[PDB]
Structure formats: structure tokens, C-alpha cells
Design a protein around this ligand. Structure first.
Ligand SMILES: O=C([O-])C(=O)[O-]
Ligand SMILES: O=C([O-])C(=O)[O-]
Ligand SMILES: [Fe+3]
Ligand SMILES: [Fe+3]
Length: 689
């Protein structure tokens, strides 16, 4: 029944002390007990936490990165919230502060003395150095980055820098005997504030710090006017114009904990009580976000508004973002590797079969396209968000998720529509597809109004024609969020493997991977959803009209398909009526938006280019189509794109998910959410907050 204490990790005496002050006042307030361990650098704490010696530590974005790397695998539990000069924030701008009357611009730092927070930190190293890589004249990875920087900066103070090999790196650092250049507050030039004393005490010429460090030290606007900011456009701007004059916007410091058995909630309990009891002028007996003048930013960031709990799918990569991640991974890659990645396009393929086709696409494209893969669509989208993949075609349902996370639709699928299959396609307005409810002509008993307790087949949970269109209509007539109870048993890949929804599913061939939301599940997709209805494992199938047409009347030859005939099938009309498959225009549940390709608004243009070429080579009228590759085909498995796609068309203006999906559907998707939400949809609300 009782639950233990959080062992907080400290890096230097002063910090140990404050930590003790913290433990003290905490028990005095009969709140969660703390313990204070002692190491000599955050790098040491990461190790200490990973080896189960400590439990938490506040870290800078840059170290969050290091922490989440393999051997350690830590994860950000809570993020500090900040000033903003406006609305509080979990992001800050890294900047380069300089004195007025020094003349040099950003592209002229060669030979200057520089003061840095510490080796490894966002705005004290990762951001400025990455920005200055182009002037470093440095090989790449085999050659130590430090050997590069040390040669550029005439002398600097970069705490934790191997001053033994690179003495120019520690040169300007003040600090007694072995105190000099320490990776803690021992070294007086450590952190946003030391980087500023090192600047202000005229020891260096430029300081790479946070957007507020100046104001944190110069309360009087007169003091400030003696300083300026190096803008990335080789101009200088006043210290208060950081929104415009910044090297970059990094994510806030965070409290990291182990990934397995890290006691996240003990940690959050602690912090929650601490803010409430000692945060913003709660107390006077102890102040959490305040430190001494000899040393600042002790334990946490002085004057942080508090913390926000970080959701649980969120790992360092998702936390940092593509942008930050890339630049950080960039300082550890050669110019060629970097350059390579920026020009290829990395598709995310979902599950085993999509990846094989992806591999073919790769070789046949002479690697203009490379591949990445994940078992589930959300996993692909996360890859798209960490920046490991660049795009993936998605169904209305998930276009919505992608959008909620800030990805935009690039181009949309255009099935072999019907008017003039001349060049129209790429400019043909996407016309969507009719979602329908299909039942066999046999069970003539069955109708819309008698679906209750019958068995059902679904393409997948989260998808338009299956999930989103019927479920949204039923939840209407039934007023209940009990989705797994409406239909007797069902198959809807992606559902709880232990719920009724996963009951009718079958897994792959030797029946493993039952219910998985990918091709492994034989009943996944519009095809699988139909097979289900057809192998008599289900009574009603929710797919788009065409699905019937493309698998009956010999068209599909797979054992199950072969003998089907469009005649054996009918459509359940909303008004209880029944019409044959072909009648669909007068008996559909709804008209959904074509699947569409999505990417970060960043890559969209490049992405569009490559896609327009690739599809011109192996597309619907691709010259090397049957020849060496057909992008839009896969033997009815609908791999990567639907097998009836003529081309990937323009969005006709609909450039945001809300515009693309349209008012109604976006709405209709939110109402349902009243019933359910997802860890991704949840992780993104935070990340895009
Ligand atoms: O933490 C740091 O050093 C930074 O943000 O620059
Ligand atoms: O993609 C789906 O599942 C659909 O359109 O029904
Ligand atoms: Fe920082
Ligand atoms: Fe769809």
C-alpha cells in the first residue's frame, strides 16, 4: 500500500543544498518525500538514472536527446513552462547576444572569443554550432566536432568540453584549479547565466543563450541598450526582438525518468505538490523556481511558471520534433549523408507487404525513394513526426489524425473516374467515393433497421467507409458509446484483441496477428472487409461500392473471390430499402474524401515533384508500368495506394485537413471522439499546444 520516495539527482554542491532545502520543506508540508543523490554532471545523472541509482533530473533539450539514446533510453516526464513575455510556453528561442560596438555579424564569428552554456546544450551548442557548420570547414563525423569548433573560436568557455585535448575550448572559463570548465555550477561560466557573465565581464565577444537571459540579468532597460542580438540574416537587433532575431526555437527543458519502471507518477505527484506549494509566490519558506546569485538555474529553471505532464506515447524524438532532431542528428553526420537525405523521399510503409512493394519502388527509382516501415498507421505518422519518414497515403479517417498533428495533404488519389480519362486526372477535381453497407442477397431478412446484434466486418477502426461513417450514424440512433456491444461479434482491425470487435478476424495464414491493422490480417482493408462478408464470417460489411465490383465476377481470382458474382450482393439503404450493388448512387451511407498523401508542410513541394515524376514513369499511363513497375497496382491487396488510382491529383485549393475533409466530416469525427480518442491524437494535442 505505501509508495516510496523520488531520488532527485544533483550535479554540484550548491545544487545538492537546494535539493536538501527542497526535501526539508517538502516533508514539513507533509507532501511527497524526496531524496537527493549526488553526481557531478547531468551526463552523470543520465547514467545514474538508467542504472537505477537515481530517478529524475531536469535536462536541456540537447541532453534529453542524449538521454533517450539506446543504453539509457530515458523519457521526458514533465516539461517546464516559461515566460514568453506573453502567453506561457513550453518552447523558447535560442539566441546569440553581443555587446554594442563590436561590429561583426553572424557570418563573421571566426576568430572571436565565445562563451557557451555547456557542451551539448540546445542554444549553448547544438543550435549555434549547427548554424555555423558551414563556416567550420569540417569533414564530418570521423573528425571530432570539437577539434573543429576549437579552431574557429579563438578561445571559449564551453563547460564539459574536453579542455585537455582542446584547451582553447576551456581557456576563457574561470574556476579554481580543477574547478575550471566544470560541467556544473562549479565553473562560474556554466549555463545561461555564466554564458552571460563570461560575456559581460568582457571575457568573450558573443554569448549563446536563451531569449530571456539578458532580461534575467539586466532588469533596467538602460543596462540592456548596451547589448544586441546577432540575427541569422547578418543584421543586429535589440535584445527584445528575439521573436524576429533568433537562431532557433527549441523545446523546453524536461524532467526525464526511465522508460520501464521509472515511477513517472511518483515524480509527477512530487512536482505537482511542489508547484502548488512552492511555485509562483505560493510560499516564502522555500521557493522552487528561485536560486542563489552565486549560482543560478539550480535543480530547475529559475522563474519557470511550472510544469505540464507529458503524455505517455511521447518519447524524446516526438518530444523534440523533426526540426530539432534533424539538426542534432546532423552534427553527427557527414555533409554527404545529410545532403542525401534531404533529396530522397522516405515513404512509410505499413506492415510487411507494403514494405516489399516499397522496396521494389526503391530500386526501380534508383533510390529517389527510400523506405521506412511500421506495423500500424499511427506508427508511420509518428515516424513522419520524428522526421524519419517523409510521407504516406492515408484514408480520410487518418488524414484527420495527421492533420491534428500538423501534417498537410499534399496530393489526392483520383480513381479512374469517369468523364474524360485524358490529362484531366491531375487537375480533375477529386470526386470522393461512396461509402456503403453491403449484405448478401440471400439474407433478405437483414436491413439497416435490423443490424442490431448481427455480425459485422469493418475495414479498420479509424477509417472512413468502415468505422467513421456507420459508427457515426449508429451512435446517433443509439445514443451509446458502447461500440463493441452493438454488433454481436465483429472484425475491425486495430480494436482490442480481447474485445468482440476482434472476434471475427483471422490473422495471417497460420492465423497469428489476429486483428492487426495491416495486411497481415486477411480481413483488414476494403478487400479483407469484403472477404469477411464473403467467407460467411460476417453479416454486414462496410466498404465503398466499388469494392464489390472489383472482387466479383471473376475479376479477383483468389480462391475465395473467383466464383463471386455481383448478383449475390445488395446494399442496405438508409431508409431501410435494399438496392443491388450497382444502385449505390441511390443507396449509400455517405460520400467520403479520397485518400490523400500527407507530409510536413516543409517537404510538400519537393514531395509533390518527386511524386509527379515517379507517377509519370510508373503510373496509370506509366510507360514502364506493366513493364518494370506499376505504382498503382498490387493484385487487389491495395498496397501503398488503391489499385484503382489513375493518378495523384491536385487538392483544388483544399490544402488543410479541415478544408480537404470538409466541415461535416471533420465535425462528425469530433462528436464520435466523445466516445473515444487515441494516444496519438492525445500526444499531438500537447505537442501542438
Ligand atoms: O540549455 C542550453 O544551453 C540552451 O538552451 O542553450
Ligand atoms: O479506408 C477505409 O476503411 C474506407 O474508406 O472505408
Ligand atoms: Fe536550454
Ligand atoms: Fe477510405
Amino acid at each position: 500500500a505505501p509508495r516510496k520516495s523520488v531520488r532527485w539527482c544533483t550535479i554540484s554542491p550548491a545544487e545538492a543544498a537546494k535539493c536538501a532545502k527542497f526535501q526539508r520543506n517538502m516533508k514539513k508540508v507533509r507532501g511527497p518525500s524526496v531524496s537527493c543523490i549526488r553526481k557531478t554532471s547531468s551526463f552523470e545523472c543520465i547514467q545514474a538514472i538508467a542504472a537505477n541509482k537515481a530517478d529524475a533530473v531536469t535536462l536541456d533539450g540537447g541532453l534529453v536527446y542524449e538521454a533517450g539514446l539506446h543504453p539509457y533510453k530515458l523519457r521526458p516526464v514533465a516539461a517546464e513552462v516559461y515566460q514568453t513575455r506573453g502567453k506561457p510556453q513550453t518552447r523558447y528561442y535560442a539566441v546569440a547576444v553581443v555587446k554594442k560596438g563590436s561590429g561583426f555579424q553572424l557570418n563573421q564569428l571566426q576568430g572571436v572569443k565565445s562563451c557557451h552554456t555547456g557542451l551539448g546544450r540546445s542554444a549553448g551548442w547544438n543550435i549555434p554550432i549547427g548554424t555555423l557548420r558551414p563556416y567550420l570547414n569540417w569533414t564530418g563525423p570521423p573528425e571530432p566536432l570539437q577539434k573543429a569548433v576549437a579552431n574557429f573560436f579563438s578561445a571559449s568557455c564551453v563547460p564539459c568540453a574536453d579542455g585537455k585535448q582542446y584547451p582553447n575550448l576551456c581557456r576563457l572559463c574561470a574556476g579554481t584549479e580543477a574547478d575550471k570548465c566544470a560541467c556544473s555550477s562549479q565553473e562560474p561560466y556554466f549555463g545561461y547565466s555564466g554564458a552571460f557573465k563570461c560575456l559581460e565581464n568582457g571575457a568573450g565577444d558573443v554569448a549563446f543563450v536563451k531569449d530571456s537571459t539578458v532580461f534575467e540579468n539586466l532588469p533596467d532597460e538602460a543596462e540592456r541598450d548596451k547589448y544586441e542580438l546577432l540575427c541569422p540574416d547578418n543584421t543586429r537587433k535589440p535584445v527584445d526582438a528575439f521573436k524576429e532575431c533568433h537562431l532557433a526555437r527549441v523545446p523546453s527543458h524536461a524532467v526525464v525518468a526511465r522508460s520501464v519502471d521509472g515511477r513517472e507518477d511518483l515524480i509527477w505527484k512530487l512536482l505537482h505538490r511542489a508547484q502548488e506549494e512552492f511555485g509562483r509566490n505560493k510560499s516564502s519558506a522555500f521557493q522552487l523556481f528561485g536560486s542563489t546569485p552565486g549560482e543560478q538555474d539550480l535543480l530547475f529553471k529559475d522563474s519557470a511558471l511550472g510544469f505540464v505532464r507529458i503524455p505517455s506515447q511521447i518519447d524524446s524524438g516526438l518530444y523534440l520534433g523533426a526540426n530539432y532532431l534533424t539538426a542534432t542528428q546532423n552534427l553527427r553526420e557527414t555533409a554527404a549523408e545529410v545532403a542525401a537525405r534531404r533529396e530522397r523521399v522516405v515513404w512509410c510503409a505499413v506492415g510487411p507487404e507494403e514494405e516489399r512493394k516499397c522496396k521494389q519502388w526503391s530500386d526501380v527509382s534508383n533510390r529517389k525513394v527510400a523506405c521506412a516501415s511500421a506495423s500500424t498507421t499511427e506508427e508511420c505518422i509518428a515516424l513522419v513526426l520524428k522526421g524519419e519518414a517523409d510521407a504516406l497515403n492515408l484514408d480520410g479517417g487518418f488524414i484527420y489524425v495527421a492533420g491534428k498533428c500538423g501534417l498537410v495533404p499534399v496530393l489526392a488519389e483520383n480513381q479512374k473516374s469517369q468523364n474524360s480519362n485524358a490529362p484531366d486526372c491531375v487537375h480533375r477535381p477529386p470526386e470522393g467515393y461512396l461509402a456503403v453497407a453491403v449484405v448478401r442477397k440471400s439474407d433478405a431478412d437483414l436491413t439497416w433497421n435490423s443490424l442490431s446484434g448481427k455480425k459485422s466486418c469493418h475495414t479498420g477502426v479509424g477509417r472512413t467507409a468502415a468505422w467513421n461513417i456507420p459508427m457515426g450514424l449508429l451512435f446517433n440512433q443509439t445514443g451509446s458509446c458502447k461500440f463493441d456491444k452493438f454488433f454481436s461479434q465483429s472484425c475491425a482491425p486495430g480494436a482490442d484483441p480481447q474485445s468482440s470487435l476482434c472476434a471475427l478476424c483471422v490473422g495471417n495464414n497460420e492465423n497469428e496477428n489476429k486483428c492487426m491493422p495491416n495486411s497481415e490480417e486477411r480481413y483488414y482493408g476494403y478487400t479483407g472487409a469484403f472477404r469477411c462478408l464473403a467467407e460467411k464470417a460476417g453479416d454486414v460489411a462496410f466498404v465503398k461500392d466499388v469494392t464489390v465490383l472489383q472482387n466479383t465476377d471473376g475479376k479477383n481470382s483468389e480462391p475465395w473471390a473467383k466464383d463471386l458474382k455481383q448478383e449475390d450482393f445488395e446494399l442496405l439503404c438508409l431508409d431501410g430499402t435494399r438496392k443491388p450493388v450497382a444502385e449505390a448512387e441511390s443507396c449509400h451511407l455517405a460520400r467520403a474524401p479520397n485518400h490523400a498523401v500527407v507530409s510536413q508542410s516543409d517537404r510538400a513541394q519537393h514531395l509533390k515533384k518527386v511524386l509527379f515524376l515517379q507517377q509519370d514513369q510508373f503510373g496509370g499511363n506509366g510507360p514502364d508500368c506493366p513493364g518494370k513497375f506499376c505504382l498503382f497496382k498490387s493484385e487487389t491487396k491495395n498496397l501503398l495506394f488503391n489499385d484503382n488510382t489513375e493518378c495523384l491529383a491536385e487538392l483544388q485549393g483544399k490544402t488543410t485537413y479541415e478544408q480537404y475533409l470538409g466541415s461535416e466530416y471533420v465535425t462528425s469525427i469530433t462528436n464520435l471522439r466523445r466516445c473515444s480518442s487515441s494516444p496519438l491524437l492525445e500526444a499531438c494535442a500537447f505537442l501542438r499546444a
